[PDB]
Amino acid sequence: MQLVLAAKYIGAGISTIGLLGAGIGIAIVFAALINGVSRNPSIKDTVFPMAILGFALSEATGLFCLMVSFLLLFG
Amino acid sequence: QLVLAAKYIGAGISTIGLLGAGIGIAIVFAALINGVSRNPSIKDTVFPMAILGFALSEATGLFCLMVSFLLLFG
Amino acid sequence: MQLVLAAKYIGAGISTIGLLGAGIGIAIVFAALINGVSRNPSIKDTVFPMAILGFALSEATGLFCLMVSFLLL
Amino acid sequence: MQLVLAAKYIGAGISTIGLLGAGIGIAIVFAALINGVSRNPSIKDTVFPMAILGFALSEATGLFCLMVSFLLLFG
Amino acid sequence: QLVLAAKYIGAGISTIGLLGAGIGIAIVFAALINGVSRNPSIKDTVFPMAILGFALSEATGLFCLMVSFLLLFG
Amino acid sequence: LQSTLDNIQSARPFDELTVDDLTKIKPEIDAKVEEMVKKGKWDVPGYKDRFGNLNVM
Amino acid sequence: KLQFALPHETLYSEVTQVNLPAKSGRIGVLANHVPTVEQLLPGVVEVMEGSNSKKFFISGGFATVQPDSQLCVTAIEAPLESFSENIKNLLAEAKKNVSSSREAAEAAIQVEVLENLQSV
Amino acid sequence: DESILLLTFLGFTGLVAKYLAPAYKDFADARMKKVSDVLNASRNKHVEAVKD
Amino acid sequence: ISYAAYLNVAAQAIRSTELQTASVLNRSQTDAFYTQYKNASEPTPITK
Amino acid sequence: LTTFSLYTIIVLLVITSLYTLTNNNNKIIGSRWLISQEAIYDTIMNMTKGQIGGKNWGLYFPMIFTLFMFIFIANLISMIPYSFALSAHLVFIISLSIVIWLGNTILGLYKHGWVFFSLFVPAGTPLPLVPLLVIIETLSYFARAISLGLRLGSNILAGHLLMVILAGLTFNFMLINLFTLVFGFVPLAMILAIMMLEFAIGIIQGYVWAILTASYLKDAVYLH
Amino acid sequence: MPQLVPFYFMNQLTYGFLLMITLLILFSQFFLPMILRLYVSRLFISKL
Amino acid sequence: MLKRFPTPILKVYWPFFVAGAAVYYGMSKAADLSSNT
Amino acid sequence: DPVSSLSFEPSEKPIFNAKTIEQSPSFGKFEIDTDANVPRDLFEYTLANQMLTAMA
Numbered sequence A, D: 001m002q003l004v005l006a007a008k009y010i011g012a013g014i015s016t017i018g019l020l021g022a023g024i025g026i027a028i029v030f031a032a033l034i035n036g037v038s039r040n041p042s043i044k045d046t047v048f049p050m051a052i053l054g055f056a057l058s059e060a061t062g063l064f065c066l067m068v069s070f071l072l073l074f075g
Numbered sequence B, E: 001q002l003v004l005a006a007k008y009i010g011a012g013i014s015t016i017g018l019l020g021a022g023i024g025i026a027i028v029f030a031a032l033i034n035g036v037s038r039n040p041s042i043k044d045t046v047f048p049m050a051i052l053g054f055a056l057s058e059a060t061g062l063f064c065l066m067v068s069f070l071l072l073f074g
Numbered sequence C: 001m002q003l004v005l006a007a008k009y010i011g012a013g014i015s016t017i018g019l020l021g022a023g024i025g026i027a028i029v030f031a032a033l034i035n036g037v038s039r040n041p042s043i044k045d046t047v048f049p050m051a052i053l054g055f056a057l058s059e060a061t062g063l064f065c066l067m068v069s070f071l072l073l
Numbered sequence F: 001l002q003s004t005l006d007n008i009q010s011a012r013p014f015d016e017l018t019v020d021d022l023t024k025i026k027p028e029i030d031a032k033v034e035e036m037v038k039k040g041k042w043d044v045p046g047y048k049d050r051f052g053n054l055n056v057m
Numbered sequence G: 001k002l003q004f005a006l007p008h009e010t011l012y013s014e015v016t017q018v019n020l021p022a023k024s025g026r027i028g029v030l031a032n033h034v035p036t037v038e039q040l041l042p043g044v045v046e047v048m049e050g051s052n053s054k055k056f057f058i059s060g061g062f063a064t065v066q067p068d069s070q071l072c073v074t075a076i077e078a079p080l081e082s083f084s085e086n087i088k089n090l091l092a093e094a095k096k097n098v099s100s101s102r103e104a105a106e107a108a109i110q111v112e113v114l115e116n117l118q119s120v
Numbered sequence H: 001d002e003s004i005l006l007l008t009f010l011g012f013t014g015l016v017a018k019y020l021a022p023a024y025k026d027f028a029d030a031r032m033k034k035v036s037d038v039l040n041a042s043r044n045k046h047v048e049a050v051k052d
Numbered sequence I: 001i002s003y004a005a006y007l008n009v010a011a012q013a014i015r016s017t018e019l020q021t022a023s024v025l026n027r028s029q030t031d032a033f034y035t036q037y038k039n040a041s042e043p044t045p046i047t048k
Numbered sequence J: 001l002t003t004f005s006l007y008t009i010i011v012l013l014v015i016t017s018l019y020t021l022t023n024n025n026n027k028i029i030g031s032r033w034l035i036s037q038e039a040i041y042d043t044i045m046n047m048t049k050g051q052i053g054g055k056n057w058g059l060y061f062p063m064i065f066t067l068f069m070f071i072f073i074a075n076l077i078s079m080i081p082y083s084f085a086l087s088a089h090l091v092f093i094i095s096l097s098i099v100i101w102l103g104n105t106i107l108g109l110y111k112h113g114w115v116f117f118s119l120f121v122p123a124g125t126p127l128p129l130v131p132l133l134v135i136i137e138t139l140s141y142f143a144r145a146i147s148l149g150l151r152l153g154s155n156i157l158a159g160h161l162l163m164v165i166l167a168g169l170t171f172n173f174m175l176i177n178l179f180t181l182v183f184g185f186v187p188l189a190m191i192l193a194i195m196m197l198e199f200a201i202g203i204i205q206g207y208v209w210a211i212l213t214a215s216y217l218k219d220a221v222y223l224h
Numbered sequence K: 001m002p003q004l005v006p007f008y009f010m011n012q013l014t015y016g017f018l019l020m021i022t023l024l025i026l027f028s029q030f031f032l033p034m035i036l037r038l039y040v041s042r043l044f045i046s047k048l
Numbered sequence L: 001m002l003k004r005f006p007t008p009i010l011k012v013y014w015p016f017f018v019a020g021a022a023v024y025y026g027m028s029k030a031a032d033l034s035s036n037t
Numbered sequence M: 001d002p003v004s005s006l007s008f009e010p011s012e013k014p015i016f017n018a019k020t021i022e023q024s025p026s027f028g029k030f031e032i033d034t035d036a037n038v039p040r041d042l043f044e045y046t047l048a049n050q051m052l053t054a055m056a
Helices: A004-018 A019-039 A044-075 B002-015 B018-038 B043-073 C001-040 C044-072 D002-016 D017-041 D046-073 E002-038 E043-073 F003-010 F018-024 F027-040 G087-102 G103-117 H002-051 I003-014 I022-026 J003-017 J033-047 J058-077 J088-111 J114-122 J132-141 J146-175 J186-221 K007-048 L014-034 M019-023 M025-029 M038-055
Strands: G001-005 G009-012 G017-022 G026-031 G037-040 G045-047 G053-057 G062-065 G071-075 I033-037 I046-048
Touching: A004 A044, A004 C001, A004 C044, A004 G071, A004 M019, A019 A044, A019 B018, A019 C001, A019 C044, A019 M025, A044 B018, A044 C044, A044 J146, A044 J186, B002 D002, B002 J033, B018 B043, B018 D017, B018 G071, B043 D046, B043 J132, B043 J186, C001 C044, C001 E002, C001 E043, C044 J146, C044 L014, D017 D046, E002 E043, E002 G103, E002 M025, F003 H002, F018 F027, F018 G009, F018 G062, F018 J146, F018 K007, F027 K007, G001 G045, G001 G103, G017 G037, G017 G071, G037 M038, G062 M038, G087 G103, G103 I003, H002 J033, H002 J146, H002 J186, H002 K007, I003 M038, I046 K007, J003 K007, J033 J058, J033 J186, J033 K007, J058 J186, J088 J114, J088 J186, J088 K007, J088 L014, J114 J132, J114 J146, J146 J186, K007 L014, M019 M025, M019 M038
Parallel strands: G001 G071
Antiparallel strands: G001 G009, G017 G026, G017 G045, G037 G062, G045 G053, G062 G071, I033 I046
């Protein structure tokens, strides 16, 4: 009993690790956005929605990690 | 029992694999933004190239996720 | 009891790790801001709103990790 | 044996970790492609064979990792 | 006594969370030195912004430290 | 032509009018729509040169 | 189009591939390229229009791909073959004398050109 | 539990009505104007041809 | 030394032998003496 | 009859009104609501003309448009705090994806015979690693079967599960000591920020669906 | 879990796939060509 | 209001329809297999 | 400027400073360097290039 509950909690912790990579990923996209906009002065009107797409996709990987963490934590 | 505990643990370990894919996707999109901002004009050719690169980057993460699920459900 | 509570304490420690990614993340956004502004000068007025947005999203990932720590506690 | 069967499932999980590296790797090749082609759009045709070679090799390291996971799972 | 043992283990693990913020801090200040050396004169505008980013990144590390202390004190 | 000027002047739907009435005065509307459906296309060429179009890429 | 020019002679008036040595190392331009500005360093330059390739020794200058795809190359003087052994020997002697001797900057150029020449 | 979530949703629809709804009104207006202007231009255009 | 002067010295070096024509050599001649001025007052017209 | 069945009916009735009660009688000018679904029409027109780009780009435009709108409406319905998603059954979203993947393979075989498999050698590469480049292309090709569905399902499911957990957490926050009642606005504001984010990732996912099954059809309709 | 094991999969899939074929036909034949009519009507007036 | 036009959906959506039927059948067996556990 | 072979019109032109080159609006479409002081180089180069032409 105790072991099964414990195991679930440990495993959830391991799953939390996955999220860090998505976090850094998001930052990288935003860094590129800033650098691009400073580079062009004018790419922004096209590029800004593109940047939002990239953000979401990077984020989605982190979402998968989180949901697996919840599946182990809550059951 | 021990085996069932081991399933829950095993799944957690597999979840670590996803982090690399997350970084990977970002790198493709960063490159898209840099390429687009640098030329302007390359953008229409490059947008499908970027989508392809995204798909492949995501795929390695997905394999990690499916292995995680396989251990989780059993 | 003892074992389950033990696992919880351990799990909490593990959860701090997720936050580390956010720590690097926040820095990257601000680094980009500083580079952009120093390069352009005057990009700043458009860019400063963008910087706040990027910060918030980066921070949010760390918050999720943090809340998992709290759940384990 | 509960202990042995557990060990297989644990060990399988551990194997899975390697694959993250290949994931980053694929993106790195693609990034170079985007920047390169941006710098000279006519280099694209020369580069595209080189690119497919690079994709495959980076992916292959991931494949080997995933194989070891499956070997622990099913043998 | 397993619970008391576990507290001490948990504390050890918690230090790992801080490391990323430490790297982060360096990255902000690196950008400052690079930018300032490129522009010369940008510095007075940029410096409030830089300090803001520096603090925000640090605050994440503080959270990790806080969870360590929270375990230690209970 | 004088009668025609007055008729064109008094037949200005410059406000608004049903597209069904435009189908009624010209079955060319439905004909082109049907031919476009037959091609599969939903792009109308010339439409975009004096009416907008949202896009992303 | 490719403008390859000297004050008194315009050698070329886009030309398929051009390979140029710039204060950026060496850059090759083929068809469309992003519209650069590059300082040309003293150089051995190859210009290819179709498969035909022509080899130039160039005194440095400026290179600028225009956003209208005109590769403006401006340089003070250039062919490789006309510049090309006794001349190198003489240049070595002159380099040496100047080496001992603004005279420092002159000697730096003498060494640079002598090496670049020595390459051919 | 979920009534807190309902407070969040009410705030969200409030935020939409504050910020987005005048912008979307303006967007819709802008497009209508352009269509109408094209239409009345076309009306003028054919009337010109009669005079010619 | 100025960038175009740097290139100039290089051009002169390229004009260093018998494998080349007179017109280059003529382009490698210098006449003028830059007539320094001040105030009206003229510091000496030192050779260019 | 099931909850899921009731929400499929609700979706049918919503989508019909956006193409009916959205413009009275249908005039040239076009009523303010139909301008929205016009701009959407165009941004998917220029996207799948921007992808598949055949003479049959518009021939697969109804499928790609009703794949947009389905996900676009069902991630507004799923954002209502007392509504149970169709995507909460992942198996339906994944089933739609597998259907599309199979409808790509059958289309690919139909359209390109036994040289459909020439898709899995993208380019000539050194001959002893041409077979390697078939294996981890086909592996990635039938990764397309589950990737497209599981992305959308997981994002929506995880977002709602996150929100419900945070709502539950702020419930128990209002059950700790009275110092939490003061300055307890900050966790409510956090749920608001996440609630804004889940709409963004739901509309983006409808576009991501429709770009990915435009990319897969770009491959499937025209070989390589 | 937020429900992840029904046994109602085939029930679900029947109503699900029916809704897809319904919307596909409904769009394709009805709602899309009346939009193409708006485009064409505006352009036919524009063209004359 | 509405005016229908019969847009091609015949052999156009033949691989799409075939896939739907196959999955419909396969999910029947899957539903039966899942109602056993 | 020798306007025609029978005329000459005295003519002038403005030499563009390196500061100008920096702040030129389509400066952003000429880019590859920032570690080379291309304004400070190009200014010098065109100081002479313009001057020679004017003299000729």
